[PDB]
Subunit: 68 residues, 6 copies
């Protein structure tokens, strides 16, 4: 009996933002005038920002191998 299994396999995950190009991004002019405004609950505001947000809860690898 000769027993010589060979594993050369790749298991790979590439999750999120990868290899992207962002060349000169951004708006020319952004202007806001706010007068006598009332807010009575939570405010989120973005004015002329650049946001690059990545969440990766995933991308996990499981390899199980058994020999008998």
């Amino acid at each position: 009996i000769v027993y010589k299994p060979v594993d050369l396999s790749k298991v790979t995950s590439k999750c999120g933002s990868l290899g992207n190009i962002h060349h000169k991004p951004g708006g020319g002019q952004v202007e806001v005038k706010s007068e006598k405004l009332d807010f009575k609950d939570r405010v989120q505001s973005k004015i002329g920002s650049l946001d690059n947000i990545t969440h990766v809860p995933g991308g996990g690898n499981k390899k199980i191998e058994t020999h008998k």
Copy 2:
């Protein structure tokens, strides 16, 4: 008996934003004038922002292998 399986497999996931080009993105002019507004619940606003949001809960690999 010779027992000699060869595994050369690739298992691959490419999840999210990959290899993109964003060349000079953005609006020319953005202008907002707000006067005497009342808000009585949550406000979300984006004014001339650039957002690149990626979520990857997925992209997981499971490889199970047995030999006998």
Copy 3:
């Protein structure tokens, strides 16, 4: 009995933000004028910021191997 199983396999995760290019990002001008505003709950505001944000709860690798 000859028993020579060979594992040379790769298990790999590339989770988050990887190999990206951000060449000269940013808006030209951002201007805000605020007068007589009332806020009565939490305010989050971004004015002209650049934010690169990455969360990776995932990307974990598990390899199990057994021989008998």
Copy 4:
């Protein structure tokens, strides 16, 4: 009989280039007042600027001359 060759080409030629500004008269030229006001500008790439009341500019990449002569006598 005998053989006689006389080879006497004479060259009196002129090759001339006159390029740019030659022999001009500029009598009392007046550049006016120049005002440049800039606020809140953004430049993401290379800037070349010239500001000035009175410019005389002469640029001459050309005006080159090439003269070739071959003289050959084979007996």
Copy 5:
């Protein structure tokens, strides 16, 4: 019989270049007042600037001359 060869070519030629600003008259030239006001400017790449009331500029990459003669006598 006899052979006589008289190779007597003559060159009196002129090859000439006159490139740029030659022989001009600039009589009382006046560059007026120059004002540059700059506030809150941003430059992310190379800046070249010139500011000035009166400029005379001559640039001459050209005006080169090339003369070739080849004389050959073969008997």
Copy 6:
């Protein structure tokens, strides 16, 4: 019989370059007042600047001369 070769080529030619600013008259030139005011400027790469009322500039990369003669007599 006899052979006579006379090889007497004459060159009195002229190769001339006159490049740049030559023989000009600048009589009483006036550069006016120059003001440069700068506030809150930002530069992320190389800056070249010149400021001044009156400039005379002559730049000559060219105006070169090349002369070749080959003389060959083969009997």
